Design a binder for this molecule. Structure first.
Ligand SMILES: [Ca+2]
Ligand SMILES: [Ca+2]
Ligand SMILES: [Ca+2]
Ligand SMILES: [Ca+2]
Ligand SMILES: [Zn+2]
Length: 316
């Protein structure tokens, strides 16, 4: 909508107060004119017709419980935008400042969040398995990273390329959580998962096996569920990325950790320069090795650590 850029204030899903960039034209809309060609947040009104209505508010105050999921979707879209721009010199998900659109209050008791090809969509959860999913910065950045992948490598969402596509989203979702620096960790969705249970999440990158996911290629899932295990076999790549960043000895193979920033550099380069729609795990290893070689040199610690991490998870 055409109007002046304004600044609202509200609470997110977890009761935290924050400022949001809004736009004024009769009502105050969730439209942030300060990043690219805009960040726009919509109300799906418990339906599944998308996008719904651009979020409109009478007073620029967003403290109702109904406001909370939209506060977070909008705000964490801005954080993710800032991460790609400031860290990777990437302007929005297409690299050309595409508008970032999100809808909240999708369906009723919907325990999930997703990128549909054009926008972000967040359920409210059923209050037991999930609370509103946009309250998780790693969930927001995970899903927006699918948009990044769709415009770059284009990793097909099935089998190995699919598990890479998933891992890439867990990796950058986690790096975005670290960038924002509020209780960061190597698990996925903990801030919005199971309000009655402390210390759990949907997935762990440091120990995929915690939730039954493979942490080594010899344990890969080879069946047909979950598009050939795209959320299952990502554990193998997640463990490798965790090793590259943090180090550790995994099934007897020692890895020297190089830290989060370098992991982010190597994997962004792999994503955008080397990976293709059909890349398998072995081809990911070669892309990551070639990325680390471009960035730090062929004899570097960084390259040796990438080789060790993939050796540790059984990927040659
Ligand atoms: Ca209001
Ligand atoms: Ca966290
Ligand atoms: Ca997390
Ligand atoms: Ca929990
Ligand atoms: Zn995903």
């Amino acid at each position: 909508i055409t109007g002046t850029s304004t600044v609202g204030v509200g609470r997110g899903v977890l009761g935290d107060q924050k400022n949001i960039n809004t736009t004024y034209s009769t009502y105050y809309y969730l439209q942030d004119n300060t990043r690219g060609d805009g960040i726009f947040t919509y109300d799906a009104k418990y339906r599944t017709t998308l996008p719904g209505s651009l979020w409109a508010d009478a007073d620029n105050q967003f403290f109702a419980s109904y406001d909370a999921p939209a506060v977070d979707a909008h705000y964490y879209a801005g954080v993710t935008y800032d991460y790609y721009k400031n860290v990777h010199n990437r302007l929005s998900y297409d690299g050309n400042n595409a508008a970032i659109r999100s809808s909240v209050h999708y369906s009723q008791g919907y325990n999930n969040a997703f990128w549909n090809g054009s926008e972000m969509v967040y359920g409210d959860g059923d209050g037991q398995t999930f609370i509103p999913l946009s309250g998780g910065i790693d969930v927001v950045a995970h899903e927006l990273t699918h948009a990044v992948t769709d415009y770059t490598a284009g990793l097909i969402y099935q089998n190995e390329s699919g598990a890479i596509n998933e891992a890439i989203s867990d990796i950058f979702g986690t790096l975005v959580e670290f960038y924002a620096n509020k209780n960061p960790d190597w698990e996925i969705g903990e801030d919005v998962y199971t309000p009655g249970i402390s210390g759990d999440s949907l997935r762990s990158m440091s120990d995929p096996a915690k939730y039954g996911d493979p942490d080594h290629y010899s344990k890969r899932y080879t069946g047909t569920q979950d598009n050939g295990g795209v959320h299952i076999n990502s554990g193998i790549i997640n463990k490798a990325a965790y090793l590259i960043s943090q180090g550790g000895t995994h099934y007897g193979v020692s890895v020297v950790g190089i830290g989060r920033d370098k992991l982010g550099k190597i994997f962004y380069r792999a994503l955008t320069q080397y990976l293709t729609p059909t890349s398998n795990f072995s081809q990911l290893r070669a892309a990551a090795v070639q990325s680390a070689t471009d960035l730090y040199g062929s004899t570097s610690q960084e390259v040796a650590s990438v080789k060790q991490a993939f050796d540790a998870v059984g990927v040659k």
